Enzyme design. Structure first.
Site, PDB file in Angstrom:
ATOM      1  N   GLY A 205      16.234 -30.610  27.708  1.00 40.62           N
ATOM      2  CA  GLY A 205      16.023 -29.533  26.749  1.00 40.62           C
ATOM      3  C   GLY A 205      17.246 -29.155  25.946  1.00 40.62           C
ATOM      4  O   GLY A 205      18.319 -29.721  26.129  1.00 40.62           O
TER       5      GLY A 205
ATOM      6  N   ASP B 215      20.403 -11.517  29.994  1.00 40.90           N
ATOM      7  CA  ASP B 215      19.481 -12.437  29.344  1.00 40.90           C
ATOM      8  C   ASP B 215      18.301 -12.792  30.234  1.00 40.90           C
ATOM      9  O   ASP B 215      17.901 -13.949  30.354  1.00 40.90           O
ATOM     10  CB  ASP B 215      20.199 -13.686  28.834  1.00 40.90           C
ATOM     11  CG  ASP B 215      19.453 -14.348  27.685  1.00 40.90           C
ATOM     12  OD1 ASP B 215      18.827 -13.631  26.868  1.00 40.90           O
ATOM     13  OD2 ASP B 215      19.517 -15.595  27.570  1.00 40.90           O
TER      14      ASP B 215
ATOM     15  N   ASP C 136      20.779 -19.454  33.710  1.00 39.33           N
ATOM     16  CA  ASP C 136      21.255 -19.062  32.374  1.00 39.33           C
ATOM     17  C   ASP C 136      22.232 -17.881  32.461  1.00 39.33           C
ATOM     18  O   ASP C 136      21.982 -16.813  31.917  1.00 39.33           O
ATOM     19  CB  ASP C 136      20.048 -18.798  31.442  1.00 39.33           C
ATOM     20  CG  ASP C 136      20.440 -18.212  30.051  1.00 39.33           C
ATOM     21  OD1 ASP C 136      21.507 -18.552  29.469  1.00 39.33           O
ATOM     22  OD2 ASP C 136      19.638 -17.395  29.533  1.00 39.33           O
TER      23      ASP C 136
END
Ligand SMILES: Nc1nc2c(ncn2[C@@H]2O[C@H](COP(=O)(O)OP(=O)(O)NP(=O)(O)O)[C@@H](O)[C@H]2O)c(=O)[nH]1
Ligand SMILES: Nc1ncnc2c1ncn2[C@@H]1O[C@H](COP(=O)(O)OP(=O)(O)NP(=O)(O)O)[C@@H](O)[C@H]1O
Ligand SMILES: [Mg+2]
Lengths: 175, 40, 289
Positions: free
Chosen positions: C29, C141, C159
């Site tokens: 990705g 996030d 992340d």
């Protein structure tokens, strides 16, 4: 698309030097009065290009007749005061904000403290001392006024310089 | 689309579109935007 | 400033080049900071994930320090295992466990989850967040994309690129960080904020799991942020499909005043989470099944 940002304030405050240091990474060594200058830059906001139109206006009283011709379609203002000039800081309250409120009442504005690096310089502090602004004082005036927020910077050292325009840009696009 | 952030990049593409000046002799403006010239 | 940062990073990573023991780097990705590949360990055949981040293409290079430091110093069942990091050319490469279940996003865009599955996910994220928040780490996030799943349905938080640290000396952060539709209103207003921003974002993720997408998603990101900033907290659209338990839960998350928003530790004791199914109950929702 396109953000319009007008920069106003008392004369000698550092509006041009702010703009030239941001856009080109140079300091203008001399002091020339601005009559009117328009600049543009591209700024990427999340990978999408915007044109940031920058309207450098005269602080000097000679060119009052001209200044508000800049104001139509303004997305955000930078109302500038040098943090080593109390007179320019009081003119934010007394003059500049009334001007832009009258012409552009829905338009957000930021209070920009300029020349913060001369807060350490002893040469200029002597003439402040003999004649007899901090973040906390300006932040109150910003919350009162009611500016989007307070930011401050030095055009010479570029401290918080990018952040001035970062917050100005966000202010414009939210409203 | 959902992964779009609010990164504000450094500026690029400097463009000095307008420089207005003031004639010392004739008490006149030089380099006005032609839109304004009618007004004053 | 590029070299100074590159040298800074050099001293913080593990030495060498993982191409020396990894094969078959295939792009899995893209992200904001860079791309994720799968790779194979030559000796054993074990798959790993490799996140590759170009130092020249970050708007705030300093945030790359988080990509190493967090998984390194905050190992936990609900955090993605990081094995090693490296400096390859102008890139930070982080090798970590490959999570085969994929992101929660894939599930909530293609399926409706029931409350037992929602509670299981929420429970795992709050277990992680409570541990991070107790040390003053704010994720910044939290959304469906940042939650990854194992084969057997265990939930891990990933992340960490946008993290920040708070403490007695710096109790609030000021930075405009995160993903528009998940951002807390105080963060968008440019007020100082704390670990509470993660709880709001978690609330927005619960809206994802029930209604399929965050509030204001059909609007552009900047107008949505203004809406989040100025409006009252957003509501679940599928009210017909929701318990008073879930509604009560979500009301503790989506509170405008950060001071009255529930903490992670407070939320771990909430009744809605007593509904949490085990790992297994999330497995059917995966794209395979
Ligand atoms: N130390 C320091 N001095 C500055 C800074 N900015 C401006 N100055 C000084 O103040 C002067 C003001 O220059 P300028 O930017 O033209 O001010 P201005 O607001 O555009 N004046 P006008 O409205 O008449 O055009 C400069 O020549 C410089 O010497 C700064 O960031 N730090
Ligand atoms: N450890 C991992 N295992 C599997 N997929 C991952 C892992 N880390 C990131 N990804 C995927 O890689 C893509 C980009 O990741 P991101 O952290 O947003 O950068 C997303 O689709 C993630 O699901
Ligand atoms: Mg000038």
């Amino acid at each position: 698309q396109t953000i319009k940002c007008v920069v106003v304030g008392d004369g000698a405050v550092g509006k041009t030097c702010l703009l030239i240091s941001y856009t080109t990474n140079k300091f203008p060594s001399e002091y020339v009065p601005t009559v009117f200058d328009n600049y543009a830059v591209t700024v990427m906001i999340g990978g999408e290009p915007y044109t940031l139109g920058l309207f450098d206006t005269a602080g000097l009283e000679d060119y009052d007749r001209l200044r508000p011709l800049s104001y139509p379609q303004t997305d955000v203002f930078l109302v500038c005061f040098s943090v080593v000039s109390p007179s320019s800081f009081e003119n934010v309250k007394e003059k500049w904000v009334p001007e832009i409120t009258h012409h552009c009442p829905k338009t957000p504005f930021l209070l920009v403290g300029t020349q913060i690096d001369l807060r350490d310089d002893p040469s200029t502090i002597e003439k402040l001392a003999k004649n007899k602004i901090t973040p906390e004082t300006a932040e109150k005036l910003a919350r009162d006024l009611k500016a989007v927020k307070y930011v401050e910077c030095s055009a010479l050292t570029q401290r918080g310089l990018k952040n001035v325009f970062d917050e100005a840009i966000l202010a414009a696009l939210l409203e | 689309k959902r992964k779009k952030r609010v990164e504000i990049s450094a500026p690029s593409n400097f463009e000095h579109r307008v420089h207005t000046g003031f004639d010392q002799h004739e008490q006149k403006f030089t380099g006005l935007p032609r839109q304004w010239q009618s007004l004053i | 400033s590029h070299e100074q940062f590159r040298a800074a990073l050099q001293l913080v990573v593990d030495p060498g080049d993982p191409r020396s023991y990894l094969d078959n780097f295939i792009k899995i990705g893209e992200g904001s900071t860079g791309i994720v590949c799968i790779a194979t360990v030559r000796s054993s055949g074990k798959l790993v994930a490799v996140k590759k981040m170009d130092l020249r293409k970050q708007q705030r290079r300093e945030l790359l320090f988080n990509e190493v430091v967090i998984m390194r110093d905050y190992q936990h069942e609900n955090v993605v295992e990081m094995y090693n990091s490296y400096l390859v050319g102008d890139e930070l490469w982080v090798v970590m466990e490959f999570l085969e279940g994929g992101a929660l996003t894939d599930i909530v865009t293609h399926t409706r989850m029931n409350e037992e599955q929602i509670a299981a996910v929420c429970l795992a994220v709050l277990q992680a967040l409570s541990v991070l928040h107790a040390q003053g780490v704010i994720h910044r996030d939290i959304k469906s994309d940042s939650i990854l799943l194992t084969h057997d349905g265990r939930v891990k938080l990933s992340d960490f690129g946008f993290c920040a640290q708070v403490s007695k000396e710096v109790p609030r952060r000021k930075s405009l960080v995160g993903t528009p539709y998940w951002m807390a209103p105080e963060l968008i207003s440019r007020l100082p904020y704390g670990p509470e921003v993660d709880i709001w974002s978690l609330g927005i993720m619960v809206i994802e799991m029930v209604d399929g997408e965050p509030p204001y998603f059909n609007e552009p990101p900047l107008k949505a942020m203004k809406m989040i900033r100025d409006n009252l907290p957003p509501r679940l659209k599928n009210l017909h499909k929701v318990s008073p338990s879930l509604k009560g839960f979500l009301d503790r998350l989506l509170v405008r005043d950060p001071a009255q928003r529930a903490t992670a530790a407070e939320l771990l004791k909430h009744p809605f989470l007593a509904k949490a199914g085990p790992p297994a109950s999330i497995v059917p929702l995966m794209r395979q099944n």
